[PDB]
Design brief:
Helix content: under 10%
Radius of gyration: 17 Å
Oligomer: monomer
Structural class: mainly beta
Order of helices and strands: EEEEEEEEEEEEEEEEEEEEE
Protein name: Endo-1,4-beta-xylanase
Keywords: Calcium, Carbohydrate metabolism, Glycosidase, Hydrolase, Metal-binding, Polysaccharide degradation, Signal, Xylan degradation
CATH topology: Tachylectin-2, Chain A
Strand content: over 45%
Binding site for Ca(2+): 68, 236
Shape: globular
CATH superfamily: Glycosyl hydrolase domain, family 43
CATH class: Mainly Beta
Site (Important for catalytic activity, responsible for pKa modulation of the active site Glu and correct orientation of both the proton donor and substrate): 115
Strand order of the largest sheet: 1-21-5-4-3-2
GO molecular function: hydrolase activity, hydrolyzing O-glycosyl compounds; metal ion binding
Bound molecules: calcium ion
Number of domains: 1
Largest sheet: 6 strands, mixed
């Protein structure tokens, strides 16, 4: 039977671990503030796994946004990177579903920041992408310490700010970073505009280093509303590999053309060509939750 005909989260992230998809996003919780965990075998039908993170096990009581979860081979443990009260935080778990907890309930650093996304390079060096409120919402990067608990502030670098027309429909916002490396090029995939705008959209930038400098793709945006479904407010997503070796891009959209809330998530195809061009395309998978 059907719980809901949607995947009821915003700012979605998918981890493919041990032949199983695991989704985490903003909202859709059933046991208080924090993050839920959804799992799936096929990307269409999802089941709830429980409350991945409870507010009592973390810094903060409000604003649990934009979670990403990674199995770190180096540490043989799961790491949940997230925002809480407009600060960036990290919790750990021995399993994909949780409970993710902080031993000490504090953020990574003191400055307000959101939209954490981790990248560990071929070198073994960890990088954290996140938003600082320096000139609108701006995507920054810094190298992390070995324990993935702190950033090295001396490595702070500015990545992307809202500059071109499609990125300045509402407010001054570049956010929801995602990093992928392919054939020596680092691709920073991000969202621009206030999420409430129907023109929330996804674009990318490239660089020969993980911390820039960055050149934006000339044909951005990659995704700014899906034509076939009429989904609008499309953004804050994540790329991920599938069982068969192809890629997909999970993202949210407004509830409908009339109402923003509650945002829900959808899946399209994703790829980086041999000539280094990124595409988000294909018929939208409209996920649902079963019990
Ligand atoms: Ca994210």
């Amino acid at each position: 039977s059907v719980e809901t005909n949607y995947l009821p989260i915003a700012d979605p992230y998918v981890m493919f671990y041990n032949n199983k998809y695991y989704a985490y996003g903003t909202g859709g919780t059933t046991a208080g503030e924090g993050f839920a965990c959804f799992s799936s075998d096929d990307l269409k039908n999802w089941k709830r796994e429980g409350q991945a993170l409870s507010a009592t096990d973390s810094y903060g009581t409000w604003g649990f946004w934009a979670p990403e979860v990674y199995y770190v081979e180096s540490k043989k443990k799961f790491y949940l990177f997230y925002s809480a009260e407009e600060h960036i935080c990290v919790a750990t778990s021995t399993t994909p579903e949780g409970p993710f907890r902080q031993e000490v309930k504090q953020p990574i650093w003191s400055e307000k920041s959101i939209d954490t996304s981790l990248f560990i390079d071929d070198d073994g060096t960890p990088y954290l992408y996140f938003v600082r409120f320096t000139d609108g919402n701006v995507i920054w990067v810094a190298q992390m310490t070995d324990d993935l608990m702190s950033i090295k502030t001396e490595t702070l670098n500015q990545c992307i700010k809202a500059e071109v027309s499609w990125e300045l429909l509402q407010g001054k916002v570049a956010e929801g970073p995602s990093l992928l490396k392919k054939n020596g090029v680092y691709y920073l995939i991000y969202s621009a505009n206030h999420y409430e705008n129907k023109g929330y959209g996804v674009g990318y930038a490239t660089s020969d280093t993980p911390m820039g400098p960055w050149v934006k793709y000339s044909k951005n945006p990659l995704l700014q509303g899906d034509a076939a479904t009429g989904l609008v407010g499309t953004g804050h997503g994540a790329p991920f590999q599938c069982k068969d070796g192809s890629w997909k891009y999970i993202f949210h959209a407004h509830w409908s053309a009339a109402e923003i809330q509650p945002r829900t998530s959808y899946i399209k195809d994703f790829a980086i060509s041999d000539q280094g061009v990124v595409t988000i395309s294909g018929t939208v998978i409209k996920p649902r939750v079963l019990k």
